[PDB]
Nucleic acid binder design. Structure first.
Ligand SMILES: [Mg+2]
Ligand SMILES: [Mg+2]
Ligand SMILES: [Mg+2]
Ligand SMILES: [Mg+2]
Ligand SMILES: [Mg+2]
Ligand SMILES: [Mg+2]
Ligand SMILES: [Mg+2]
Ligand SMILES: [Mg+2]
Ligand SMILES: [Mg+2]
Ligand SMILES: [Mg+2]
Ligand SMILES: [Mg+2]
Ligand SMILES: [Mg+2]
Ligand SMILES: [Mg+2]
Ligand SMILES: [Mg+2]
Ligand SMILES: [Mg+2]
Ligand SMILES: [Mg+2]
Ligand SMILES: [Mg+2]
Ligand SMILES: [Mg+2]
Ligand SMILES: [Mg+2]
Ligand SMILES: [Mg+2]
Ligand SMILES: [Mg+2]
Ligand SMILES: [Mg+2]
Ligand SMILES: [Mg+2]
Ligand SMILES: [Mg+2]
Ligand SMILES: [Mg+2]
Ligand SMILES: [Mg+2]
Ligand SMILES: [Mg+2]
Ligand SMILES: [Mg+2]
Ligand SMILES: [Mg+2]
Ligand SMILES: [Mg+2]
Ligand SMILES: [Mg+2]
Ligand SMILES: [Mg+2]
Ligand SMILES: [Mg+2]
Ligand SMILES: [Mg+2]
Ligand SMILES: [Mg+2]
Ligand SMILES: [Mg+2]
Ligand SMILES: [Mg+2]
Ligand SMILES: [Mg+2]
Ligand SMILES: [Mg+2]
Ligand SMILES: [Mg+2]
Ligand SMILES: [Mg+2]
Ligand SMILES: [Mg+2]
Ligand SMILES: [Mg+2]
Ligand SMILES: [Mg+2]
Ligand SMILES: [Mg+2]
Ligand SMILES: [Mg+2]
Ligand SMILES: [Mg+2]
Ligand SMILES: [Mg+2]
Ligand SMILES: [Mg+2]
Ligand SMILES: [Mg+2]
Ligand SMILES: [Mg+2]
Ligand SMILES: [Mg+2]
Ligand SMILES: [Mg+2]
Ligand SMILES: [Mg+2]
Ligand SMILES: [Mg+2]
Ligand SMILES: [Mg+2]
Ligand SMILES: [Mg+2]
Ligand SMILES: [Mg+2]
Ligand SMILES: [Mg+2]
Ligand SMILES: [Mg+2]
Ligand SMILES: [Mg+2]
Ligand SMILES: [Mg+2]
Ligand SMILES: [Mg+2]
Ligand SMILES: [Mg+2]
Ligand SMILES: [Mg+2]
Ligand SMILES: [Mg+2]
Ligand SMILES: [Mg+2]
Ligand SMILES: [Mg+2]
Ligand SMILES: [Mg+2]
Ligand SMILES: [Mg+2]
Ligand SMILES: [Mg+2]
Ligand SMILES: [Mg+2]
Ligand SMILES: [Mg+2]
Ligand SMILES: [Mg+2]
Ligand SMILES: [Mg+2]
Ligand SMILES: [Mg+2]
Ligand SMILES: [Mg+2]
Ligand SMILES: [Mg+2]
Ligand SMILES: [Mg+2]
Ligand SMILES: [Mg+2]
Ligand SMILES: [Mg+2]
Ligand SMILES: [Mg+2]
Ligand SMILES: [Mg+2]
Ligand SMILES: [Mg+2]
Ligand SMILES: [Mg+2]
Ligand SMILES: [Mg+2]
Ligand SMILES: [Mg+2]
Ligand SMILES: [Mg+2]
Ligand SMILES: [Mg+2]
Ligand SMILES: [Mg+2]
Ligand SMILES: [Mg+2]
Ligand SMILES: [Mg+2]
Ligand SMILES: [Mg+2]
Ligand SMILES: [Mg+2]
Ligand SMILES: [Mg+2]
Ligand SMILES: [Mg+2]
Ligand SMILES: [Mg+2]
Ligand SMILES: [Mg+2]
Ligand SMILES: [Mg+2]
Ligand SMILES: [Mg+2]
Ligand SMILES: [Mg+2]
Lengths: 46, 77, 10
RNA sequence: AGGGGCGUAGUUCAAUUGGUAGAGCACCGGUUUCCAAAACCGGGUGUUGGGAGUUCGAGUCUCUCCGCCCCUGCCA
RNA sequence: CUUUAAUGUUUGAUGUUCUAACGUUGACCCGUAAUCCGGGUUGCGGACAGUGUCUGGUGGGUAGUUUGACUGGGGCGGUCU
RNA sequence: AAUUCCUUGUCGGGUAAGUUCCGACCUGCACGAAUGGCGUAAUGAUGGCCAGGCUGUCUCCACCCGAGACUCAGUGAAAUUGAACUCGCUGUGAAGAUGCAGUGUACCCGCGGCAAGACGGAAAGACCCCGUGAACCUUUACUAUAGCUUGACACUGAACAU
RNA sequence: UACGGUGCUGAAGCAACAAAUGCCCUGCUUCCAGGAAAAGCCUCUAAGCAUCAGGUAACAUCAAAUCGUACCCCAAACCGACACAGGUGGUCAGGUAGAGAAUACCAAGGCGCUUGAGAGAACUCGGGUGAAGGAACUAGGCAAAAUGGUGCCGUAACUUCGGGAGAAGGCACGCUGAUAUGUAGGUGAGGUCCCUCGCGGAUGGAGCUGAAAUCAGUCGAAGAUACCAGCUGGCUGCAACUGUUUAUUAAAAACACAGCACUGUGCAAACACGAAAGUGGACGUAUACGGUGUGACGCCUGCCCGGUGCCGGAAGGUUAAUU
RNA sequence: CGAAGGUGUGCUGUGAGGCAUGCUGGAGGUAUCAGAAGUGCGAAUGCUGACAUAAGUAACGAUAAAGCGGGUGAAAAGCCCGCUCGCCGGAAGACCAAGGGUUCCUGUCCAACGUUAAUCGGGGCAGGGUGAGUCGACCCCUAAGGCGAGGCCGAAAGGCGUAGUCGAUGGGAAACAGGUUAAUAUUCCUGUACUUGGUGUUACUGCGAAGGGGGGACGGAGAAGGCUAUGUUGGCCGGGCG
RNA sequence: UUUUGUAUAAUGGGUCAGCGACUUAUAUUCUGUAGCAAGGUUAACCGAAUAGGGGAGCCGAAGGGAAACCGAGUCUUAACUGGGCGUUAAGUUGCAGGGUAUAGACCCGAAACCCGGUGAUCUAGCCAUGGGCAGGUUGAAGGUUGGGUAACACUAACUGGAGGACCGAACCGACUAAUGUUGAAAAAUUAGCGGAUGACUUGUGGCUGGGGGUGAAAGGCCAAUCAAACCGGGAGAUAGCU
RNA sequence: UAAGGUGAUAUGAACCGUUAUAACCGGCGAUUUCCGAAUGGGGAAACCCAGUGUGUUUCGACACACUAUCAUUAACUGAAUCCAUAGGUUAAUGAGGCGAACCGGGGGAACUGAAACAUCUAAGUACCCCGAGGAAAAGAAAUCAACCGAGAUUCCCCCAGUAGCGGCGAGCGAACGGGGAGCAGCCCAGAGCCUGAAUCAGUGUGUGUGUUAGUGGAAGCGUCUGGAAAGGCGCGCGAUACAGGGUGACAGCCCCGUACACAAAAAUGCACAUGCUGUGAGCUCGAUGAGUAGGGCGGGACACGUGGUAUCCUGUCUGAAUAUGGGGGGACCAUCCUCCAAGGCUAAAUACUCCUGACUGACCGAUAGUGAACCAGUACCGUGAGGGAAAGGCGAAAAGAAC
């Protein structure tokens, strides 16, 4: 039965990719928080 | 935005009162109006977004004097 | 969590 | 059951709400009509559900008691 | 003092006509390779409309809340000095 | 009557017998005309009722074919669990006893079964109540408020007529 | 020669018929609900060149980079915590029977589903059959059983004339032979004429393919023999209907619905989303749009404006900021 | 010459306790009197870890089905080979996209992983394997839409939007058959082709835009006709005489 | 543990080990204790600095009265023989403790409110661009040819191929029953069932964001969560309750 | 600085060094792929696609450089429209982003408390946004006092839980004045006479003192137990060194250090001096911040909730005097004191610690202490934001067990 996750690389990068996140300050604040936390993977982009 | 180009008046916030003194947040905005002022020196009409209080000071101060301050302010009339 | 079906009295 | 309302002339209703109960119709009597009615004139009618009271005095005020209405009697 | 007739004044009330503020989601020109915008020309409207402050009305459209207790469970009824 | 409390109203039809159904009656507790009324072919995994066919649905189950259940080998959980040397009865007792009293019965221990009890397991009861708990929703509850609307002043001027 | 393989050689390699959902076809015909854009490409000339440049044509020649390319891909490799009876778009579409991509049996191809071996109890699950009765079961014919195809005959109330209707109900179906040794039909060679001449036309009928019907015979209990494949009728409530809905206990009489009416709205429209700009409404203009209620169709839709709203009026009473 | 710690034993106090010792361990410990507290645990459906119970019980994942011989091996119901049987065959076959990321091939191994064993595996380990002018992507082009110079608006942040610029699920140049690897192929090889640009030569010569026009360019349904894929039969070739 | 009351068939606990809850700051009152004493003591700060300096201040030795004021008295009243409150009685500064107050205030636990973000890879609607719907029926309008009319109308036959038309696979839906309920599966399987050229279905993108969306409307859906999503923060919210 | 050395798991191999070009440490440079403000365009970050110019040539190409936007300035051109202006093209500078807390400003809750709940409280807190610095802000009286005086601002202790505010409930809560820390005053609103005066900012030039590598650094033997001595038992010695760490059990004298004494080619901080480049000192005479103060209306800030409410800020509407004059002295008036707004600048005392060094602890000792003593913001979970673990110890030496 179809579940909530249907993979799509193009959709995933356009929604949460580095350029999509950094386009706006709110996403840039996510990067600032993850940089402050020391996350190994800042965004979802490979 | 709603900013007077002469006096610099900008929106401020306050309270609506009542007979029960209930306070609700509100905004006070300037009485801004777009007017075409005749500047004699350039023999031209220059349009300014001015408040009603700003209109009074233009007569008192002169059209040229206020613009001189505006150029110092870098407001880009 | 789950779906505790019931016969609650009424 | 429980709670509110009601009982006034022959039938339907006013009441004053402490000191003397009216209206409409009906009924009766007399006109008018060949006659009935319709119309006109005149008029008598009431323990104000029953009781016990309250008062100097109760159809009215209070409480029971009959009869007639109106509401409720619910959650599992 | 009244009755006040006229007299100037000071405020308003309408009505009419203007343009010059203001409006134009009319036309035309330019910025310009542009259905934006700005400027220009012109027409129309015009001291309105529209906006600000203040203010009366309206406003479950949207909020913040209240909506008692006793009680042979509660509610209803009754009660609270 | 998707509407009738009394109520299985009364009568008729259908049945051997029909509180349902169908037809009437009207006494409409408490139908009713676009919060539509009455009818209506067709349509309906629509509701109710009836008939034929059909059958293990049943009277009343029997046998058979497979998959489990059972035995062996291998692998190997789970919910639960104060501790147990964990019988019946009658009585008592936080008022329904394996555990108290009295009495009866019972060699020790598996396996296959059935679920009467352990107020069995599951989940700090959804019903009820309480808290000067929460939330949504309603309105002619209260107080506000967006919005809408009124006027004054400002943006906003001239002339003339009364 | 290492079961592989390697090397050499290698015949026929045609026709007819059937035939697509593929191609002609982005066609043709028809309908109303009236069915992208841009660039490449073709062409036209401005300004700017018109000796040049550039264009056209023919050769020669260079260049065509970079990234992906294994494998799974209806699944043990993806989404479901699992090597999970679930889900997941496109392309390909063999033979016999059949209308068919249904279904049954097979081809190509791929598999036997990662615990078995015994036993052959109760009981449970999935099935088979059943004397007699045939809904007596049960809330209820739940379930099961039954019906089931093609051709033909025949088919009621009612109806909006379309329906109802596959109404109901019934008959014939195999095989063999004959009509007719393989028919009607379809396809169509050779041959023979014609051509301003070809992938030609007209004759022509060989050879293939091939129902359907009738008659005769024959077997069985049974010939739509398996799989596949409507139960039917009668009364009535509700909703007109197809549709939509509570993903995960409710598919309905609920919602929607066409239709009807009221009301708002003159277009810088009402309204709505937006502090605003603006956008939708609409590149529409009252034969339009929004809101509300009702809900096809047929016959119809009565009385009340006191209450509450809404609309109109504006004299008077009352009344804010302001003065 | 054996500290704490642990584990026994003995003694002792009204108690929380204390003292001593045997063994374990192998380096710290600490009198007394004061001082300070993360100072004393059985419970909180407490928290974390470990281990029980049910229990060798349920289950071992579609009732499509297996059997035998041989091989390898320490060991074979499960692997390999062979012969049968059974299942799918509009799929349970074949090729892709999306998605995964080496699961592909070979060698090697059986701890763990596989609901059993396992010599086997999508397990572990080590190597190998993905070859493009024509297939895609990239590229050119645009849809919805996104972003958006200036601009308009907005307390700030920002919102909207013009010119523009992105954005395929659409529109745009060209390759087929055969062979070959343990694993790749319209990519490699063989044979035979094609396309778009660049440059040069030769001949003939009006070219030219961000501009114009054409084209690209488009629905639903239905009806046939002409075909092919494909299938059948015959013929032909080869083999067979059961 | 909670109760008038529990062997209770009321709650808790499978067991062990570890962890786990009366603390801290400031101020105030009371007790104990120490120092000084009608006095006591410093704070900040200075300072080689736990000393010393710093008496700024604080408390006490005098109260009465609303207050001005008066004062061992004073207020009340015109005034008190009066009456109320006072006048003999040591306090103050440390330390410890018992309390209180403000802070989370012993610990664990809400349903919620508010703020800023993340989500339409599920689903709902919409937008753009593509795809899918075997086969078999019914035979509308229209058209042609007749018959009929002056011409129609009308009628017959033949062509035609209309439909939210019919039967029925793919596809989509999910009505009944059985199984399954610590499942093969956190909604499925088996046998039947409805739609199946359309208000159909589907792929790939896009858009609408939380008091908001979207909704052929069920308070449905908005990432297994919806009468107000998720994440973080306010926050150790609050909890007269367990 | 050096006799050893090629980072770690983590050996090995092949080597480099040994008296000074091994290595190591520090100063200064060189190089510094791709993404990222990312800046040539685009983009699903670490990729795709260019243009211009210079220089290369094997005629296939190749190598560098430049090309974002905005602000400011200056040139050149350039509409409607004659000049102009808008606009356009260049060239120079500057800004973009990141980062803990602290700071200023623009916005700004609710839970909660009030045993409910509106005013109020929570709270101008949380949070969002803008901007800046090493501090920031504030700051040189239109201030307070009270008839005596004080003399900018900031911070601490008092004043004082006082005066007051407050459904006068909950609660909120000063000032005057005093004691301290630290102190600093100036400029413009204009012209002269003087004159480059003081002072400040640039820079060089030295000195002093740091910082970024380093150098030396005292003094014990014997015996006993024991695997091993730093322990026991003896006898010494150093100490401006008995701080610590390590060494086979507890080391003043074994080692590293420590106390002391020293060190810088180069870079750099700080301070003083000095030289240039700006910068103006002093004197006289003037001038003395107007849509402002004030007022009406609506709010906000002052402890102060409109109250009798001064004072401050202003959204709105008005509107002075101006030194012969104004402001304030908590309604208001008079008197008297005090000050001079409507222009600016200003160190110190104050707040904080992402980071660097040293040191300290009646702080923890692997369920504790940071979530993380371990390759931890990892594995893992979630579409995403986000959430988020478990896991330390052989022995002195691996001598890690040949056979
Ligand atoms: Mg109820
Ligand atoms: Mg409300
Ligand atoms: Mg509240
Ligand atoms: Mg009560
Ligand atoms: Mg109560
Ligand atoms: Mg009834
Ligand atoms: Mg009967
Ligand atoms: Mg009936
Ligand atoms: Mg009705
Ligand atoms: Mg009606
Ligand atoms: Mg029905
Ligand atoms: Mg029957
Ligand atoms: Mg027992
Ligand atoms: Mg008993
Ligand atoms: Mg018993
Ligand atoms: Mg049983
Ligand atoms: Mg049982
Ligand atoms: Mg129980
Ligand atoms: Mg409850
Ligand atoms: Mg391949
Ligand atoms: Mg392959
Ligand atoms: Mg699968
Ligand atoms: Mg799951
Ligand atoms: Mg998985
Ligand atoms: Mg699918
Ligand atoms: Mg099939
Ligand atoms: Mg059996
Ligand atoms: Mg059964
Ligand atoms: Mg059967
Ligand atoms: Mg049989
Ligand atoms: Mg039978
Ligand atoms: Mg029989
Ligand atoms: Mg029966
Ligand atoms: Mg029965
Ligand atoms: Mg049935
Ligand atoms: Mg059947
Ligand atoms: Mg029928
Ligand atoms: Mg009925
Ligand atoms: Mg319906
Ligand atoms: Mg339907
Ligand atoms: Mg459901
Ligand atoms: Mg659905
Ligand atoms: Mg259902
Ligand atoms: Mg309706
Ligand atoms: Mg009506
Ligand atoms: Mg009315
Ligand atoms: Mg009226
Ligand atoms: Mg011992
Ligand atoms: Mg040791
Ligand atoms: Mg503790
Ligand atoms: Mg328990
Ligand atoms: Mg267990
Ligand atoms: Mg077993
Ligand atoms: Mg058992
Ligand atoms: Mg068993
Ligand atoms: Mg079993
Ligand atoms: Mg299996
Ligand atoms: Mg074998
Ligand atoms: Mg088969
Ligand atoms: Mg691997
Ligand atoms: Mg393999
Ligand atoms: Mg093994
Ligand atoms: Mg592997
Ligand atoms: Mg190639
Ligand atoms: Mg390639
Ligand atoms: Mg191609
Ligand atoms: Mg934009
Ligand atoms: Mg911009
Ligand atoms: Mg593009
Ligand atoms: Mg594409
Ligand atoms: Mg067409
Ligand atoms: Mg063919
Ligand atoms: Mg007891
Ligand atoms: Mg018990
Ligand atoms: Mg002292
Ligand atoms: Mg003193
Ligand atoms: Mg006295
Ligand atoms: Mg004391
Ligand atoms: Mg105390
Ligand atoms: Mg249909
Ligand atoms: Mg149907
Ligand atoms: Mg169908
Ligand atoms: Mg959901
Ligand atoms: Mg809410
Ligand atoms: Mg939260
Ligand atoms: Mg808080
Ligand atoms: Mg709490
Ligand atoms: Mg760039
Ligand atoms: Mg409260
Ligand atoms: Mg600095
Ligand atoms: Mg040294
Ligand atoms: Mg002055
Ligand atoms: Mg003023
Ligand atoms: Mg005011
Ligand atoms: Mg007051
Ligand atoms: Mg007063
Ligand atoms: Mg005031
Ligand atoms: Mg430990
Ligand atoms: Mg830890
Ligand atoms: Mg911790
Ligand atoms: Mg551990």
């Amino acid at each position: 039965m179809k579940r909530t996750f249907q993979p799509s690389v193009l959709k995933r990068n356009r929604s949460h990719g580095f350029r999509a996140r950094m386009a706006t300050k709110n996403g840039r604040q996510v990067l600032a928080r993850r940089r402050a936390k020391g996350r190994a993977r800042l965004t979802v982009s490979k | 935005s709603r900013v007077c180009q002469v006096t610099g008046k900008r929106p401020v916030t306050g309270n609506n009162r009542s007979h029960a003194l209930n306070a609700t947040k509100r905004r006070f905005l300037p009485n801004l109006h777009s007017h075409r002022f005749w500047v004699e020196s350039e023999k031209r009409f220059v349009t300014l977004r001015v408040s009603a209080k700003g209109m009074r000071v233009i007569d008192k101060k002169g059209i040229d004097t206020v613009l001189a301050e505006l150029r110092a302010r870098g407001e880009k009339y | 969590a789950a779906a505790a079906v019931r016969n609650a009295r009424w």
